[PDB]
Structure formats: structure tokens, C-alpha cells
Amino acid sequence: SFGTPFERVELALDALREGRGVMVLDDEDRENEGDMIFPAETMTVEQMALTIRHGSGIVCLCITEDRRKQLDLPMMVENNTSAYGTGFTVTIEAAEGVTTGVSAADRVTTVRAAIKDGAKPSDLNRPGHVFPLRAQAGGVLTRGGHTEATIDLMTLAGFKPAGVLCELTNDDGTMARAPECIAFAGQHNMAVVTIEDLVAYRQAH
């Protein structure tokens, strides 16, 4: 890489603000993945389209524990037995403005439905094809995962604490590793930052 943890985080924040996305890489001894993330408020149909096309296709919406209650999306399992304690809630669908809810456009509508000011639970049907992740309070200083990094990022950048995220994926079905992600981030002018970088930053500030 290049530069300090700190300028990478600031470029990250500019990117988001600028409508560009971010590639968030994490601990090579963890997920070892990089996530294409964008703010729920700005992510374009075109962008969502590229995330379905090059990501896992399992495109998630990072939300706060406080918005989770507002929409009343129960956590998915009470005995979350998952390796990463990943914070899946019940899945969602825009209650209208969509169809099968799986096209790019439909998922963006659903994200906007979820993030709207004054968004009420009736605004969402269940189940659906957008996957909310409840970010652990204290973000990356508490839990050091993509979910948290996202919210920490929206928050610093000045947005609502809500972000779309998805794993980069080699055409062969294997996960993209660091080198791949960074070239891809390169080609799409999304700022590369790592969870190490954001934990360094928050602490510092």
C-alpha cells in the first residue's frame, strides 16, 4: 500500500462523499475479503448492478441497532451459531415500488425504503432479497468486521449510519483476495482502506 492509515481513511471519506465507493479489506487471518460498499443514500442502480455482477450477489444493508428496532426487524437467529457472529436480521422487501425485488433497481428502492427518514416497519415486507446487518455498538473498536467498518465510515463521512456492502468475487467463483480487490478498486476508482486502518483512526481520534 501507500501512505498512512490516516490519509487512507480520509480518502475513504472523500470517495464516499464523492459518490465513489470503497473497498474495505480486512484481516488476512480473518475473512480475508474486501467489500464493495456505498452509502445507502447515494448508491446508484448502475452501482448495485456492478455489485450483483462482481460481488457475492448477497448484497447487505448495514444498519444501526436503533434503526433495526424502528423497522422492527428481529435478529434472524437467537442462537447465532455462525463463525463470524455476522449480524443478519430478517431479510426485507420494499413494500411497493418493486416486483420480485431481485433486480438491481428493486434492491436500491428497498434500501431507500429501509433508510428513509421516518421509515416504518410496514414499509417493508418479509422475507425479501435485501439483507440487513445489525452493526455492533462501538463499531470496529467493539467488533472488527465489514458491517461495523461500513457504519463507522458513513458516520465519519457525515451520512446516515447505513451502508450497502458485498464481497468481491473472482469469475471462477473463488473469493477475490487482496491483490484482486485492489486492482478492481483501482479500475472503479473506489478508495481502498482496511479495517486495521479504521481501528487505528478511531482510536487516534
Ligand X SMILES: O=C(CO)[C@@H](O)[C@H](O)COP(=O)(O)O
Binding residue count for a second copy, defined by CB under 8 A: 50
Place of cell 478492481: 184
**Least separation, in Å, of the C-beta of 84 and ligand X?**
4
- Is there binding between residue 49 and a second copy (CB under 8 A)? yes
| Contact pattern for a second copy over residues 136 through 165, marking x by CB under 8 A | ------------------------------
The distance from CA 132 to its chain's CA centroid, rounded to whole angstroms, is 9
> 479489506: which residue's cell?
25
Residue 193's contacts (CB-CB under 8 Å, 6 or more residues apart) are 8, 9, 11, 12, 22, 23, 24, 25, 153
- Give the residues lining the site for ligand X (CB under 6 A): 31, 33, 35, 56, 58, 60, 84, 86, 100, 133, 145-147, 166-167
- Phi, psi angle pair for 154, to nearest 5°: -60, -40
3-state secondary structure (DSSP) of residue 6 = helix
Site string for a second copy, 115-134 (x = CB under 8 A): ----------xxxxx-----
**Whole-Å CA distances, 67 to 72, 73, 107, 167, 173:** 8, 9, 18, 23, 33
77 binds a second copy (CB under 8 A): yes
Name the binder of 142 from ligand X, a second copy, none, CB < 5-8 A by kind: none
Q: Consult the annotation and say whether 112 binds a ligand.
A: no
6 binds, among ligand X, a second copy, none (CB under 5 to 8 A by kind): none
Alpha-helical runs (H) found in 23-103 = 45-54, 65-71
The C-alpha cell at 126 is 418479509
Of positions 9, 61, 98, 181, contacts a second copy by CB under 8 A: 98
Grouping H, G, I as helix, E, B as strand and the rest as coil, residue 126 is strand
- Does the annotation list 8 as a binding residue? no
Alpha carbon 171 to its chain's center: 21
Q: Which stretch binds a second copy (CB under 8 A): 17-25, 78-86, 152-160, 196-204?
A: 78-86
Residues that bind a second copy (CB under 8 A): 31-33, 45-46, 48-50, 52-53, 55-59, 76-77, 79-84, 86, 88, 90-91, 93, 95, 98-105, 125-129, 166-167, 169, 171-175
Residue numbering of the annotated binding site for D-ribulose 5-phosphate: 30-31, 35, 143-147, 167
